[PDB]
Symmetry: D2
Subunit: 321 residues, 4 copies
């Protein structure tokens, strides 16, 4: 398939590069993160990707406790990104990196990126760290409501990307570093953060918000029925502040991408849960090979009409292209 | 469908009853359900095509008793009670053992006692154990539990790894959201990861004949299993965990999942295309779930009639050697 | 779900009533007749009780397609269409109409479609397969040359054409000899209709009129499941197909066809169709009065698909297709 | 996947070679002929390169079923079976065989089946639909009374019966008039075979002989997708069906049939079948030489199913069905 849109495609700046064992692989990953116009573009051309919505790597800004430096790095990353997109505006779009450890500053940088730089959304690597940085700051908290109101005003999607939990909140993985990251930890962290947003009633207050989750929903689709329907015989209203069910907000305010989850069975389950209209193609480059994502998607077992929507038209619609 | 086998069916004894809402008329009903075995439960089984019910103590129960002596005491009592209840109707009730795993040796002894002397057909443990001050979750992939697993394999009976909530110090991500703890989500995360720890530790290389059972359709594992092994596939460097093979291998070869508290056809279809119908078992999670809810859904779920028979009955019959 | 649109919903006029006599046992004949003749009363109460806002009505089968005499066919067609317009006018907020066409006379059929659409406001046409004319011994399929002008007018008026089933003529039914239970909805209807659809595709009709919209009931008359094979059988033979059409069957099916759930309330079938043609091209329908409205609605309300798709298949796809 | 078993794999003898002539263009005819006559070379090399350990061979179509003279049919069947036995004996660790039967003569077909199974070690029979006999103008379906003795023997011998396709006779093909491209594997084959199978079910054959194992290729010739409708159409009519069989079509399909992936390398189709008849009754097959072995194998090795089912469908279901363990 040609003319695809991919939106979990990362890059890095020298300042955040270290955020991502010794050898040829680490060397290649660094080159990939810093490259935009050469290797990346050539692969896009060879693998039917017309539009790539770029985002800074992780955890990047979310792991910078000093709000002052966080704002500085965010602005720096966004300016570099703007410069890179300007070189091939027909191929590259961008997500804003935000210094959410400072709500007001984050709201202001998002406005700058959207109104001044033409960015089409924001991508945040989970909870923020601030001050001593020992407390994970989730976005369902009161201090972030103004920010969400502005996100809804600008009407641009918010991509809730993964990050690892803090060491003190990772005991379950002690002795198992291989379970952290993309293997599992990433999904758990992001799925719950997403659930917190839903449970908080955020989408009752701002129903037009568009949240995006990669890796096919971080496991949410398969368990969505249980999330709401467990112990169904208990006919008492849910205790959380949100007015409706998790499935309602997930179906109405979320979109999921195929980033790093090239599995047909998983895609079928998702199509039968959230629907093809809310699934978007993405690769997770440079952490995943573009050819791997594209070859799989070009041949996955779905209707051709859905391959067109998932690979291109859903995104073009979502980002008003 | 008639003649079904259900195996995540709970009961409680006065000592563990409190572990199991609000002041609402629901708490009263739940209590009655947990304490009942021969009456209400049996009538529902007769009304909903369930011939065999493999009973297990509630949660967290024994896993939440930090004092070894006490844990060993409560477990033995819960197992003696269970043994007595099953003896009243051996043609309908089977049993899973409650184990005081905060004491590896005592747990091994009690499992042997239950299996060899009481005829229990397996064990059901509610996640990690608490011991001493009870501030450290004790996972079963740890070295001290290897002798135990060797005995489990020797006795050749399944181990049902059931959920429990993580300790508060390990649940900050849920702070302010108590509604996310329990069956809503926390149970799955806790159990899925414990299962992965067992896999990564190489436990199944050492004891390949082990049979582990997970409820709630695998605690989310099937949907993400491909990613668990294949994420960042371009990096051809070998994984550094002790296990010799991949997660999917151990999941496909040493695990079975049940339909407990997850009556969703889409989820069942995904599981069928991931682990296979031969590895899926009907279960309800009674009394936390209504038996009629579980049965009505399963009787009509969109699968092959041949698979409805296997998932609803024959897979469990074979697994627990009920035909011979 | 409320506000659904159903479009394979039949009625009959005295002149065509007997055509449905041989499709149900004698004990059910009186009831089927009542249903076929009723539009304003019981039918509407069933619609209200089962969340159906719009019902696009059509004459029963084979009706006009089984009238060998051109003059008579044109007469009955106009009559049925006039009656249908009368009934819709009684409840214009709930009923829409498909035209009955005397296709044994191409020109007359073209004229009648124009009258129905431009003058009566009908939203499409429903034809029960091939037509009989003259001695009525030869099935007349619509891929034939003489029907090209008609198709050009269908595309110009831009209204869908519902290719409905009918049984094959006796001389073309020997495979069912001794098995009358295989004729009709059991199987013969699907074969007859699926092949007729393939004939239209293979003839290149959609190359000439790419904007045509064809609708098939009973989930595509079996087409989705075998569509890959229809084009890809013997793929090693790298030569172009021998038929007139310039492209593949899958292209025309994917681009010019829509299928409904009439008389095929099977979740597995719906899932296969979703993964072959997509939810955007599947429409809810019941096949009342040959199928119970509650059977269709109850199944569709609970089938295992995304809620977003239940809304599309149940309502918005049809509203989009018929420009409502 | 290695060690696969494939069971809709054809070959031909000079006497039946021309039967496959019209099914392929002119330039590809030479290649197809080579493939049909080859068993020990090209075929074996493809099996070794594409993980196929066992190939259950069968004569091409329509072959014997299109020979109206009983005597000639009996001769051709026997000749074809002897050649096949000869070929299998060259590499018995890789090749097994399906008997060709002269069903235009019930008693003769019964005797030949016995000969192939008892004396030649054949593991079943493959018949290309209805038979033609005498004037050959009447399709003879196997649900007819004269074939009951035959079926009784099939059940006694306890070997599967592969109901393979064939095109209907011209007078029974008017729906395809003007569309020769709709005959054969494109569609006519499936319609013809699906209905023949339904006739067997409706006749009550499986009530009388419940241990029969019937096999259909091309993923059930379309049956799985419409199976619910076949039994449940017009469900509001609460009156039993009119056919002589005691139960439902779905019951006989679920209990007496097995389907193969021959010439239908489609994942969506396989998923539907898995949810209708179950993975335990789906078997890998290619339809070589009409389909490329690599096409079938590459698709099956990667299709979206549980690895445990890939093993069953690709090998163990067949080994179990043909008692190879
Ligand atoms: O997608 C990512 O952002 C990512 C990382 O940031 C680190 C490792 C793997 C990975 O997929
Ligand atoms: O053990 C369970 O399965 C359970 C509980 O112990 C408490 C709430 C829900 C539940 O499913
Ligand atoms: O027109 C129909 O839809 C129909 C019949 O005409 C006869 C039986 C069943 C049926 O669905
Ligand atoms: O016998 C077959 O299987 C066959 C043919 O005889 C002709 C074309 C395709 C095909 O699969
Ligand atoms: Zn990423
Ligand atoms: Zn439980
Ligand atoms: Zn109809
Ligand atoms: Zn064949």
């Amino acid at each position: 398939m040609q003319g695809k849109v991919a939106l979990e495609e990362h890059f890095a700046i020298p300042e955040t590069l270290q955020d991502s064992v010794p050898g040829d692989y680490w060397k290649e990953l660094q080159h990939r993160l810093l490259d935009i116009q050469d290797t990346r573009l050539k692969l896009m051309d060879a693998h039917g990707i017309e539009t790539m919505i770029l985002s800074l790597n992780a955890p990047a800004v979310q792991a910078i406790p000093d709000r002052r430096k966080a704002i500085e790095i965010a602005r720096r990353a966004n300016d570099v990104l703007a410069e890179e997109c300007a070189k091939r505006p027909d191929r590259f779009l961008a997500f804003a990196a935000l210094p959410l450890q400072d709500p007001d500053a984050a709201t202001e940088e998002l406005q700058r990126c959207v109104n001044d730089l033409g960015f089409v959304g924001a991508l945040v690597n989970g909870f923020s760290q601030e001050g001593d940085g020992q407390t994970p700051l989730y976005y369902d908290l009161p201090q972030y409501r103004p920010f969400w109101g502005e996100v809804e005003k600008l009407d641009v999607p918010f991509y809730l990307h993964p990050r690892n939990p803090l060491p003190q909140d990772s005991r379950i993985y002690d002795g198992h570093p291989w379970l952290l990251g993309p293997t599992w930890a990433f999904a758990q962290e992001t799925a719950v953060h997403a659930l917190r947003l839903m449970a908080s009633g955020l989408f009752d207050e701002h129903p037009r918000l568009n949240i995006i989750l990669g890796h096919m929903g971080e496991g949410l689709p398969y368990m969505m029925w249980r999330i709401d329907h467990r112990n169904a015989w208990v006919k008492l209203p849910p205790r959380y502040p949100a007015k409706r069910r998790f499935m309602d907000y997930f179906n109405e305010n979320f979109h999921i991408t195929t980033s790093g989850n090239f599995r047909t069975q998983t895609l079928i389950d998702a199509i039968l849960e959230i629907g093809a209209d809310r699934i978007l193609f993405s690769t997770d480059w440079p952490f995943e090979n573009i050819d791997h994502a594209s070859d799989w998607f070009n041949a996955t077992s779905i209707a051709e009409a859905d391959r067109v929507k998932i690979g291109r038209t859903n995104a073009r619609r979502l980002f008003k292209l």
